[PDB]
Amino acid sequence: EKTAVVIDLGEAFTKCGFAGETGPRCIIPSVIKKAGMPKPIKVVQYNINTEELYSYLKEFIHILYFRHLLVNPRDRRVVVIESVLCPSHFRETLTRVLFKYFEVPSVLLAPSHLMALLTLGINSAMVLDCGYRESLVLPIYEGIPVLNCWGALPLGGKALHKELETQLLEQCTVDTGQSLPSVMGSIPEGVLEDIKVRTCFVSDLTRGLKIQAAKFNRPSPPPNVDYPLDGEKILHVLGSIRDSVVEILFEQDNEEKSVATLILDSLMQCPIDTRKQLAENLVIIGGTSMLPGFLHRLLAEIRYLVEKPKYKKTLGTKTFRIHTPPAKANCVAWLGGAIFGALQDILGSRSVSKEYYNQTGRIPDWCSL
Amino acid sequence: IANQPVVIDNGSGVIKAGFAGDQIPKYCFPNYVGRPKHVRVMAGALEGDIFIGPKAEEHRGLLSIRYPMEHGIVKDWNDMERIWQYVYSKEQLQTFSEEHPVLLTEAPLNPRKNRERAAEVFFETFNVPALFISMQAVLSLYATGRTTGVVLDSGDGVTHAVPIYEGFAMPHSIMRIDIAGRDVSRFLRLYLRKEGYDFHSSSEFEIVKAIKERACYLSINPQKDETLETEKAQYYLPDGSTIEIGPSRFRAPELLFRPDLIGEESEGIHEVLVFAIQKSDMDLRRTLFSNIVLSGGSTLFKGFGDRLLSEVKKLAPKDVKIRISAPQERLYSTWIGGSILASLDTFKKMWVSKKEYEEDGARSIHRKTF
Amino acid sequence: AALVVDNGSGMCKAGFAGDDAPRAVFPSIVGRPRHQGVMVGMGQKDSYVGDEAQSKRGILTLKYPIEHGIVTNWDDMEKIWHHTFYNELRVAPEEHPVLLTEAPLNPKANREKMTQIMFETFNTPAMYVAIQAVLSLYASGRTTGIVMDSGDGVTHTVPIYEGYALPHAILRLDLAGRDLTDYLMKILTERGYSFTTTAEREIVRDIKEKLCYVALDFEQEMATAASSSSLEKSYELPDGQVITIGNERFRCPEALFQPSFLGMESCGIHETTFNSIMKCDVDIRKDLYANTVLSGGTTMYPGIADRMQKEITALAPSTMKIKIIAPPERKYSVWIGGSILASLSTFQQMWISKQEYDESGPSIVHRKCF
């Protein structure tokens, strides 16, 4: 009858396509290309002028639906996959742009973790979404997301970018156009993403502990490979640096916090009957989880933290299984929204319509009244 | 050995100390231990790394704070021993533990194991001659001067309501919740993620407590405030950057009356006050409604008492004279009562001596408290 | 032909007439979930019932409709009946007659409302309300004998002699399994095992069923608990966590024999049965002493029949021969009696009909009951 639209906005990338198709049609990055502009500006931003955001969202949606969808969304429904705890200011702006400017029939602002759970096809699961800005945890038990049990450290893609920028600046080796360290003050983000995808090798638990021991009073430094760059300035990036950048994601000491500890804190907050099913079904999604050799380092670190005396008195013996999804780790949240929209013309009714928005005021966020 | 006894008013958020027969506690500071983030190579004997009290308040950015107590129940005992040692040390009291008797405070219906381990610390590590543990509700009534009345209290750890009538504390009429100032601060942090201004670190968590203390107000009608659009008031950080708080300032303390927003089932402040009065005998209910006493820091929100009246009017029987009394010094009400209790001549009979503890043990401490 | 439905406050039991044991057995609970603005995936039930609420316990607010054998929420009780007939039993209520059970000395309006729901909403062809003790005695086989019935709702006693119930010698008691479960949950909190939410109410209930037992002598059992740690058993939860308690096994069901622990100011089950027998006629006491029948789940503690024999002999004269009838199937004795009552041919003329209800109304049931 009518295949609905699926959107999954974010600061780094944006998964978008049709509901029903196994995986999206395209994934253009969040930034936009403007005429007479030095650098490309990011679309998804927080704490900034309302009318400017509205114009930025219109500009991104306009370049999206022609290239991605090849259709007017005026014919059929939309599924805007907002991550839970995405600012209400930003949701209101999205609601305005979809109804006032474009005039869609319906919209939906559903959470990312519940839809990622629909892909697995199980009702209870602990979920971790390691995106660009934050690494958010949220356990779901029998459909309902357990909200007060949660956690989100500023330790996703953006933290890894900042650490790469710091460590490369400290130890730099650029070719002539050899020596000459710290010539350029900063480096672009698109290049630094390509370095993370290709170079950064994720270490094991025993290797990670050896690196942590070396930092505070050297084993397994290799391997190292150079990275090519434009304008005839190749830089000889090292092997110990990229491993040290990955290590800060799992660094426990002096914060009592990490990607692994965040699941345990979420499990601690959850009730006793819910506890065991969440431990059995531990789902990992998001952008940072696509890194090579990540799921072992997490599961081994999780287990090491359970062996510690502080978590034995509550958790103890637990079968931590990581049931992986059908689609890739970044594109699990989108696939869930595509499942939610395509199949059920019935569950399209619960979402907010154009008729309801004009008279009322806004889509209902999880708040009072 | 009858020296001027010390009154250590315990608490998860704040800890207070001084001497008997005083007007206000001279030594008040928050109950936590601070450790440097970027720690040294050794992970055993640290040096120059422990800050308790005003040093820790001064140097927030350096220290990763952690509270030893949670819901009026200590988790980390080594931290509480260091805090008690800091209280007795020359940086605060300038007196020995050997000289003076001790008056400790605890919330009602706590674990007995923690009470025994508390006594073990005071008797053996410190060399106390005599120790006495008491309730928060009984002390608040000593400070006001009354004998009758309910004591609703709301600290950082526990919220509980104990009805007392002419020096008769009713054990089966006690109500208790794990919903308090710390939890209110946790959900204000959760809501400021929805505003945009995310916080994560333990030093950074104290900014959320400062926002809660300063800019929060309880609406009379929560449905009416939701239908209306908020003004989005401002607040300056210690750094400098301005923060539009928005609807999170009024929705944060709503928690205490509506714990359904948590996702964990609790009675709430208003139900606990009614339930404590209802669970007591029929003839005592009207006197308990007339003498309602407030205490703790989470009763200091704007329009809190006005809301707490309206909830009592909704639940309680009609045509009954309600009266939620509250002193000027609500945070210090518990310490003042301890200082008054310590100054009385009966205090010598109530306490647990060192010799009596060595003979009997934990059983004598459980007998003397109740 | 006829259906028997023992609407217990805890376990709602139901099945067919002329059967050994009931088919439909489940806890009478109606768990409604945590209502937050966030959505839920692939549909779900708005209000769960029975074993479904017990399976998905962690989230749902478990509220029992019957409180002390008294139906508080009638919409909740209507959903449980609906769950009994259509889902569990798989048979319509219009075809089969329906035997029901209430405890004696209940509110008169509750039978009328129970009967109204059966005829108006459910459209039953014929119904009856029996006393639980009368059925428990009828399951045991004897016509003569007092029945110390004790469930999670209400403990009560009904002395009967040669098929003649003594309605004025009946003594209803407020103490019951739910009050014992709440007492066990409180004394667990005293030794550092805090259970606040209603999801943990079922775990402590399950702990109460397994570990707890009636003491022969309480002061002796308290002395042995202090000395040795062999009595201290361990119970693992649904979660991998495991806990150990020493004093709380024998101390929990002692509340039946000493109501002073709970704060009820009532007679214990041992002397309540005695007081019931003394209220009867003097000539028919010997047979009531001989046939001291027990029934319900609160009489399934190991060694309860031995404690009843000790206490009743201590109360009564030395010449009397005391004897407690304690069968293996005393947990489901009320339903078995209803099945035997439904199977008899004499009971076919004792039913209420639709035409009789339309003529009279709800007040006809009081004549038919006793």
Can you put this structure into words, describing what you see?
This is part of a larger assembly, with chains A (369 residues), B (370 residues) and C (370 residues). Chain A has 369 residues and is α/β, with parallel strands linked by helices. Chain A has a domain at 157-249: ATPase, substrate binding domain, subdomain 4 (Actin, Chain A, domain 4, Alpha-Beta Complex), CATH 3.90.640.10. Helix content of chain A is 38%, strand content 11%. Chain A has helices at 50-67, 88-102, 112-120, 157-170, 189-198, 205-215, 239-247, 259-269, 272-280, 295-307, 309-312, 332-343, 354-360; strands at 5-8, 15-18, 31-32, 41-42, 78-81, 109-110, 125-130, 135-141, 144-145, 151-153, 282-286. In chain A, strands 7, 8, 9, 10 and 11 form a five-stranded mixed β-sheet that branches. In chain A, strands 2-1-5-6 form a four-stranded mixed β-sheet. In chain A, helix 8 (259-269) packs across helix 10 (295-307). Chain B folds into three domains: 1-136 and 334-368, ATPase, nucleotide binding domain (Nucleotidyltransferase, domain 5, 2-Layer Sandwich); 137-178 and 267-333, Nucleotidyltransferase, domain 5; 179-266, ATPase, substrate binding domain, subdomain 4 (Actin, Chain A, domain 4, Alpha-Beta Complex), CATH 3.90.640. Chain B is built from 15 helices and 15 strands. Chain B has a five-stranded mixed β-sheet, with helices on both faces. In chain B, helix 4 (136-144) crosses helix 12 (333-343) and helix 9 (269-279) crosses helix 11. Chain C is an alpha/beta fold. Chain C is built from 15 helices and 13 strands. In chain C, the strands form three sheets. Chain C has a six-stranded mixed β-sheet, sandwiched between helices. In chain C, strands 8-7-6-11-12 form a five-stranded mixed β-sheet, sandwiched between helices. The radius of gyration of chain C is 21 Å and the shape is flat. Chain C starts with a strand and ends with a helix. Classes of the chains: A alpha/beta (369), B alpha/beta (370), C alpha/beta (370). At the A-B interface, helix 2 of A face helix 5 and helix 7 of B.
